[PDB]
Amino acid sequence: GSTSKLKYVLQDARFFLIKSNNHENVSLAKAKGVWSTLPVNEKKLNLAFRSARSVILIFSVRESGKFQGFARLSSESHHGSPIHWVLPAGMSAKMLGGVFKIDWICRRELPFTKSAHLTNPWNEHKPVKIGRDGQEIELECGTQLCLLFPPDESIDLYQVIHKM
Ligand SMILES: O=C(O)c1c(Cl)cccc1Oc1ccc(F)cc1
Numbered sequence: 786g787s788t789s790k791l792k793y794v795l796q797d798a799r800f801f802l803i804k805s806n807n808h809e810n811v812s813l814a815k816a817k818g819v820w821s822t823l824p825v826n827e828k829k830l831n832l833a834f835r836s837a838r839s840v841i842l843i844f845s846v847r848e849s850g851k852f853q854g855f856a857r858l859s860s861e862s863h864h865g866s867p868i869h870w871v872l873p874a875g876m877s878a879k880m881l882g883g884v885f886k887i888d889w890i891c892r893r894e895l896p897f898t899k900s901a902h903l904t905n906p907w908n909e910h911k912p913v914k915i916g917r918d919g920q921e922i923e924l925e926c927g928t929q930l931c932l933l934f935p936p937d938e939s940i941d942l943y944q945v946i947h948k949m
Pocket residue numbers: 804805806807808810811814820821822823870871872873876877878880881
């Protein structure tokens with residue numbers, strides 16, 4: 786299977802590692818195509834969205850040993866139908882910023898064992914699995930990381946390719 790469409794989507798991308806707190810919220814985000822974060826990281830992502838042809842979120846639930854997929858921002862965050870996230874301990878829906886609409890590019894998992902050869906120059910050349918929530922990943926490392934994920938037959942890139 787050709788990777789030309791995915792390489793096109795990634796040509797001028799920025800990449801951010803999302804260290805999700807709860808697997809259930811990743812499931813919600815996957816199903817509904819929406820995501821939200823704290824205003825600190827939100828502002829950084831809204832700026833990125835204006836700065837690059839694609840902004841890619843690469844999800845890795847904390848302590849999971851895996852990435853759970855990756856998605857492209859379709860919009861800057863907006864404030865809308867409320868999403869009922871599973872709120873982690875000591876968190877409240879008030880702490881969250883607006884909602885990003887996101888188009889999932891892959892919803893299949895990638896174990897850290899499969900990315901162990903990739904290092905992120907923008908995180909001190911550490912293996913790319915290592916990073917805080919919102920860690921930016923350099924273009925080539927991010928591109929290669931996305932290309933390691935298995936093909937996802939539930940995904941059709943047509944809508945993304947049209948939004949571009
Ligand atoms: O990381 C998640 O589980 C998560 C996701 Cl995927 C989407 C939306 C919210 C999430 O959790 C939070 C809930 C409230 C907060 F104030 C901060 C994070």
